[PDB]
Amino acid sequence: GKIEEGKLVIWINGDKGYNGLAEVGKKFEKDTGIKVTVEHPDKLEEKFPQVAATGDGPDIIFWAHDRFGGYAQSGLLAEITPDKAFQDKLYPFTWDAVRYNGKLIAYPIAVEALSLIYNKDLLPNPPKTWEEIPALDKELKAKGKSALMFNLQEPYFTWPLIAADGGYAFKYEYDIKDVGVDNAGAKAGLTFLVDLIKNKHMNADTDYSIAEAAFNKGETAMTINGPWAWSNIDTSKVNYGVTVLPTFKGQPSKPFVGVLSAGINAASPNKELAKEFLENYLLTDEGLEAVNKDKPLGAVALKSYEEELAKDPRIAATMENAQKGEIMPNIPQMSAFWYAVRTAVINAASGRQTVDEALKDAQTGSELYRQSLEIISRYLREQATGAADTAPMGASGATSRKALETLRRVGDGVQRNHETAFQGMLRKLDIKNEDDVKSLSRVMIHVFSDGVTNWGRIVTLISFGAFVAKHLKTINQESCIEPLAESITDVLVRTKRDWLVKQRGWDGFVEFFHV
Ligand SMILES: COc1nn(C)cc1C(=O)N[S@@]1(=O)=NC(=O)c2ccc3c(c2)N(C[C@@H]2CCO[C@H]2[C@](CN2CCN4CCOC[C@@H]4C2)(OC)/C(F)=C/C[C@H](C)C1)C[C@@]1(CCCc2cc(Cl)ccc21)CO3
Ligand SMILES: OC[C@H]1O[C@H](O[C@H]2[C@H](O)[C@@H](O)[C@@H](O)O[C@@H]2CO)[C@H](O)[C@@H](O)[C@@H]1O
Numbered sequence: 001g002k003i004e005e006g007k008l009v010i011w012i013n014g015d016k017g018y019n020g021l022a023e024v025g026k027k028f029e030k031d032t033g034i035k036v037t038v039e040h041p042d043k044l045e046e047k048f049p050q051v052a053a054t055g056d057g058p059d060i061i062f063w064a065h066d067r068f069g070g071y072a073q074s075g076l077l078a079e080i081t082p083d084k085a086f087q088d089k090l091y092p093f094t095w096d097a098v099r100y101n102g103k104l105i106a107y108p109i110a111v112e113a114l115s116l117i118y119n120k121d122l123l124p125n126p127p128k129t130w131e132e133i134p135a136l137d138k139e140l141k142a143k144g145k146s147a148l149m150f151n152l153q154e155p156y157f158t159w160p161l162i163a164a165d166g167g168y169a170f171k172y173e174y175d176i177k178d179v180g181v182d183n184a185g186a187k188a189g190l191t192f193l194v195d196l197i198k199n200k201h202m203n204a205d206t207d208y209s210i211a212e213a214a215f216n217k218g219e220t221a222m223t224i225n226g227p228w229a230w231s232n233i234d235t236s237k238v239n240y241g242v243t244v245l246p247t248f249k250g251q252p253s254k255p256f257v258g259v260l261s262a263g264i265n266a267a268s269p270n271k272e273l274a275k276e277f278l279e280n281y282l283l284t285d286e287g288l289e290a291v292n293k294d295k296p297l298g299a300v301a302l303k304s305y306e307e308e309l310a311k312d313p314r315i316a317a318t319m320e321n322a323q324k325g326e327i328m329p330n331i332p333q334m335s336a337f338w339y340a341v342r343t344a345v346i347n348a349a350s351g352r353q354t355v356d357e358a359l360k361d362a363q364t365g366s367e368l369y370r371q372s373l374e375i376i377s378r379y380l381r382e383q384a385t386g387a388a389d390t391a392p393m394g395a396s397g398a399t400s401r402k403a404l405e406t407l408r409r410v411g412d413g414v415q416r417n418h419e420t421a422f423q424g425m426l427r428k429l430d431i432k433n434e435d436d437v438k439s440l441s442r443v444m445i446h447v448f449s450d451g452v453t454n455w456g457r458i459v460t461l462i463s464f465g466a467f468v469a470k471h472l473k474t475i476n477q478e479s480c481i482e483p484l485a486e487s488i489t490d491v492l493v494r495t496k497r498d499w500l501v502k503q504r505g506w507d508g509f510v511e512f513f514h515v
């Protein structure tokens with residue numbers, strides 16, 4: 001498609017102050033004559049990369065900063081270049097959340113962290129620990145109430161508990177190879193949650209709407225939610241407090257902290273209008289107030305307005321929880337991490353998998369991109385140069401090593417046996433440079449991904465990749481090999497994610513072709 005020139009289309013999630021944002025849109029229109037349309041489509045964070053890839057979608061996309069590195073890596077976002085005067089009006093750490101490969105890829109809006117929200121008329125003093133919640137629920141059940149209800153369908157809400165005793169996404173000291181999804185800490189956290197469900201203190205089917213309705217109707221004493229939820233609680237007239245999340249095994253719950261951010265679509269012909277809107281209408285005291293009055297933003301990036309908002313105890317509590325938590329990475333692998341952990345929590349909560357089974361799969365899913373890249377990059381580069389990479393494999397190194405040696409055996413068999421067809425494709429594709437390499441993804445998707453899924457055809461995908469890498473070296477295009485490896489890996493892990501996790505990833509590969 002093609003984005004329409006001379007207006008702005010904005011996407012923002014359905015839990016945010018989109019009516020307030022439209023009010024800012026109307027102010028923009030009054031000055032400029034430019035119509036601003038605000039939409040809140042379902043699953044917009046999944047829809048955006050799909051539609052933006054074809055040159056379509058909104059001019060401006062709002063989401064937490066974690067999704068934006070993936071969008072930027074895919075070429076879907078315009079670089080943001082505000083002047084010093086504007087940059088200095090927002091907190092430096094908020095700009096850090098929207099920096100990717102040394103470039104700003106969005107405007108930061110507000111800092112979001114989950115807090116414990118409690119009904120003061122049911123629980124005058126909230127529990128300091130997760131461990132006391134079962135007993136509290138038993139006490140409340142005798143009054144026809146429950147202790148706690150929160151969204152169990154999105155791992156964002158369960159993550160603070162998983163991370164408490166030592167669960168982590170990607171180690172920070174980031175070591176992207178070091179994933180902490182199936183360690184003792186993560187298992188302890190998720191087992192506690194599953195035990196709450198087993199003991200009928202929570203229901204595995206509880207989602208955002210169910211938890212919100214139960215808290216706002218006075219049926220449950222506590223919920224876990226962000227600043228955006230406070231408006232509906234205000235309307236309900238529940239006498240509520242916002243406080244520090246309970247501890248688990250004596251340690252703070254560690255929410256993953258988000259920075260609501262606004263990115264500009266790389267395909268937009270309205271980039272100057274978008275910049276003007278965001279800098280001089282939205283990111284002002286009046287603009288943010290308009291949004292905040294609809295649904296609270298949390299701790300805003302704009303220093304001048306945050307000085308007012310920081311006096312609110314609910315914002316103090318938000319920032320207390322934020323400081324105990326961690327700012328989310330914006331690495332492209334966050335989407336896969338979230339999908340992996342989402343499935344794990346849901347499956348463990350429903351009883352479809354045990355906690356061990358669930359987190360094992362989540363670990364495999366979260367490691368999949370980087371492990372696949374290590375194997376594929378190494379094979380392509382050693383095939384092209386004739387010499388192996390001496391660098392340590394790192395995390396899950398036996399698997400990588402054994403997958404690579406398996407690939408050497410089976411892949412060299414494919415290349416030899418199918419040399420003529422490989423030569424025919426190589427010449428027909430006519431790959432000369434980094435631009436021609438960029439075009440191969442669509443062809444790989446059409447030929448590899450649409451065909452039957454098995455380890456044989458995965459070996460062909462990679463082996464032809466090695467054949468191309470050899471050619472690139474020969475023609476003094478050795479710099480194209482790593483981009484090629486990244487492209488093959490993306491195609492493999494994106495299109496065959498679910499199948500790969502079912503095989504136990506590269507351990508399945510090694511087993512399948514064992515001599
Ligand atoms: C017991 O059985 C086996 N054990 N083991 C170990 C393997 C098999 C086995 O049977 N495997 S197999 O089923 N595999 C495929 O079909 C297959 C799988 C993945 C592929 C892939 C194919 N692709 C086309 C191939 C390349 C050579 O000619 C292709 C061919 C033959 N076709 C026939 C149709 N014609 C139409 C006109 O243009 C030429 C084209 C050539 O694909 C069917 C082929 F030879 C496959 C041989 C495999 C061994 C069969 C390469 C692609 C698309 C091109 C771009 C591109 C770029 C990179 Cl970097 C990387 C990859 C690619 C995607 O990856
Ligand atoms: O549940 C995984 C999900 O978590 C975060 O999404 C949050 C978002 O940051 C909040 O603004 C609010 O909308 O709640 C969401 C959870 O439903 C991540 O930002 C997101 O990428 C991830 O998929």
Ligand SMILES: [Cl-]
Pocket residue numbers: 004005006007
């Ligand atoms: Cl128009």
Ligand SMILES: [Cl-]
Pocket residue numbers: 494495496497498499
């Ligand atoms: Cl899949």
